[PDB]
Write a protein that binds this DNA or RNA. Structure first.
Ligand SMILES: OC[C@H]1O[C@@](CO)(O[C@H]2O[C@H](CO)[C@@H](O)[C@H](O)[C@H]2O)[C@@H](O)[C@@H]1O
Length: 580
DNA sequence: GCGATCAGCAA
DNA sequence: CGTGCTGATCGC
């Protein structure tokens, strides 16, 4: 049942038609400066396989790749675009990306290869990538005959599936979401990843040295207090020392033993001096292992840059994720960890880091969608939302809001932004589930529009089977009808929350597209480096800061027009740490 | 080697 | 009893 195709030794004119399904295969998970193992082209003239060395050296093929008027349909075009950028080759004209199309149709499917996307439309004349390349240590590129047939079958699937996928997207009112938002964003993320972020490795190595010393000191103190040496990083061995040898009370249990999480340890500190030391050890160790050694492992020795990969087709909220390295969770809340950011510096001499972030975009989105009079007024006055929330739920005047009250209201707001349960809020505030539920009840009394929205969206999710965001992103919630309380409750919370987090994701994605267009019109050298959910990090010549102070916030604030204003704060400095 | 476990970081 | 990511430990 083999598929017919030409194993070309050279490029020909019919291979350069104005429309084609194109496969530029990069097997390595991390595609930065990675090998392209094969190329496949399927168009009106037939199916072809090309060896990279040949195609990529052919002037006509390269010109075809870079010609925006020659339309290509692909799967994960960002992967191909970046691998080509490392080879100094520009990829243009990608009018359809099957990975992004599948992602928008149903992000829950977890489509990660052509075969998975194809199976959505009952097309199975293509093998999963894992079946062809294997996994782990067994991972390997097969012989040419096997490789060629696979790439051709993937190209063939893309060629056949474009129409049905576009048709369904159109029915879902998601055609513009793909063509005007996700696909243009894919090219921007490609530029960001390729640019990378410069790292001051010397600074990082010096911090590591200092941490190594502090860890050694705390480590010995721990053994001294424990009366014996053991593996501190082993919750198992640690649990024995704490709850058996030292007899500390067991306040929480894990699936396999005693809980030793920070929240638990904090409660045990008063009982024994070893506890504070364990917490200190955990803090230093986390910075050392994850943020010092971890970062140093992925920095490119020649340029001293790290090149993350943004996964644009994973979350059911529409948010982006970051890997190898993950640059969306670099420490900032605790000063010792925050210092790690001093190691992230501008890539050019006399350039600076510029960071802009939306102020409470999620709650502003909620005010808009729920049309809650109180919440909308709060943002129209640009009030400190935590103080305002405290005033309302605790029924007091602004001057009567104490620090503890604001902290708890802030936690309630966090819970609303991330859609946590009463149990989750209770754990975050170290209170009972009942008291946490009471806080939520008071919040609904103060913001009846939000309560009405939460009730209505849950009913809508049950009726339609899904919920949608501002720009029509969709999330199916089959568990909304489950007779299992916990399972159904999570689905209900996601029905309430996805439109909030998801719309915020839509907005910043559009802002990135609008920003790049403006930077180009203005002829600025400034460029995006990272996205951290509601923040955008750029670098630019020091001479462009003043213009950026006005341009970036404006473009981000005007990305969409809501019933309440959008507000963006910004800072810049010599390092990411200083961009505060 | 590799998956399960537990831990902790960010918006 | 939000998510996604990475790292240390540990049994098969
Ligand atoms: O010196 C290494 C040796 O010490 C043990 C404890 O007996 O573990 C310590 O060192 C590890 C590496 O720094 C940490 O992960 C661990 O938390 C700390 O207690 C042994 O496991 C190890 O062989």
């Amino acid at each position: 049942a083999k598929m017919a195709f030409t194993l070309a030794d050279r490029v020909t004119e019919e291979m350069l038609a104005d429309k084609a399904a194109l496969v530029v295969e990069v097997v390595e998970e991390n595609y930065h400066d990675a090998p392209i193992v094969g190329i496949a082209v399927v168009n009106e003239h037939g199916r072809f396989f090309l060896r990279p060395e040949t195609a990529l050296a052919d002037p006509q093929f390269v010109a075809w790749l870079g010609d925006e008027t020659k339309k290509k349909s692909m799967f994960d075009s960002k992967r191909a675009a970046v691998a080509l950028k490392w080879k100094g080759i520009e990829l243009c004209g990608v009018s359809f990306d099957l990975l992004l199309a599948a992602y928008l149709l149903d992000p829950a499917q977890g489509v990660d290869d052509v075969a998975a996307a194809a199976k959505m439309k009952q097309y199975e004349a293509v093998r999963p990538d894992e079946a062809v390349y294997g996994k782990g240590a067994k991972r390997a590129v097969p012989d040419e005959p096997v490789l060629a047939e696979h790439l051709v079958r993937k190209a063939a699937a893309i060629w056949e599936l474009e129409r049905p996928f576009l048709d369904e997207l159109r029915r879902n009112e998601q055609d513009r979401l793909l063509v005007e938002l996700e696909q243009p964003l894919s090219s921007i993320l490609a530029e960001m990843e390729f640019a990378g972020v410069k790292v001051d490795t010397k600074r990082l190595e010096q911090m590591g040295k200092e941490l190594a010393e502090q860890l050694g000191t705390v480590e010995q103190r721990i053994y001294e207090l424990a009366g014996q040496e053991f593996n501190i990083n082993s919750p198992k061995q640690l649990g024995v020392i704490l709850f058996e040898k030292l007899q500390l009370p067991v306040l929480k249990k894990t699936k396999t033993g005693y809980s030793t999480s920070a929240d638990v340890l904090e409660k045990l500190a008063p009982y024994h001096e070893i506890v504070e030391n364990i917490l200190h050890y955990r803090q230093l160790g986390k910075l050392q292992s994850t943020y010092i050694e971890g970062l140093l492992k992925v920095v490119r020795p020649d340029t001293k840059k790290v090149h993350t990969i943004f996964n644009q087709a994973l979350t059911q909220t529409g948010r982006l994720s970051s890997t190898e390295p993950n640059l969306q969770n670099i420490p900032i809340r605790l000063e010792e960890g925050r210092k790690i950011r001093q190691a992230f510096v501008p890539s050019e001499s006399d350039w600076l880091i510029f960071a802009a972030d939306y102020s409470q975009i999620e709650l502003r989105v909620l005010a808009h969608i729920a049309e809650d009079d109180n919440l909308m007024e709060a943002f129209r006055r640009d009030l400190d939302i935590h103080t305002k929330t405290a005033m309302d739920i605790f029924q007091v005047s602004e001057d009567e809001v104490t620090p503890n009250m604001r902290r708890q209201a802030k936690a309630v707001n966090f819970g609303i932004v991330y859609g946590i349960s009463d149990y989750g809020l209770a754990q975050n505030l170290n209170i009972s589930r009942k008291e946490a539920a009471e806080f939520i009840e008071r919040y609904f009394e103060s913001f009846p529009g939000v309560k009405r929205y939460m009730e209505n969206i849950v009913q809508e999710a049950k009726q339609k089977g899904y919920v949608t965001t501002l720009l029509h992103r969709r999330r199916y919630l089959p568990d909304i009808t489950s007779r299992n309380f916990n399972v159904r409750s999570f689905a209900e919370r996601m029905a309430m929350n996805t439109p909030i987090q998801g719309s915020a994701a839509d907005i910043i994605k559009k802002a990135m597209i609008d920003l790049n267009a403006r930077l180009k019109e203005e002829r600025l050298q400034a460029h995006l480096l990272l996205q951290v959910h509601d923040e955008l990090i750029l670098e630019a010549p020091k001479e462009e800061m003043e213009r950026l102070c006005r341009l970036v916030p404006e473009v981000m604030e005007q990305a969409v027009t809501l019933r309440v204003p959008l507000k963006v704060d910004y800072h810049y400095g010599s390092t990411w740490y200083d961009a505060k």
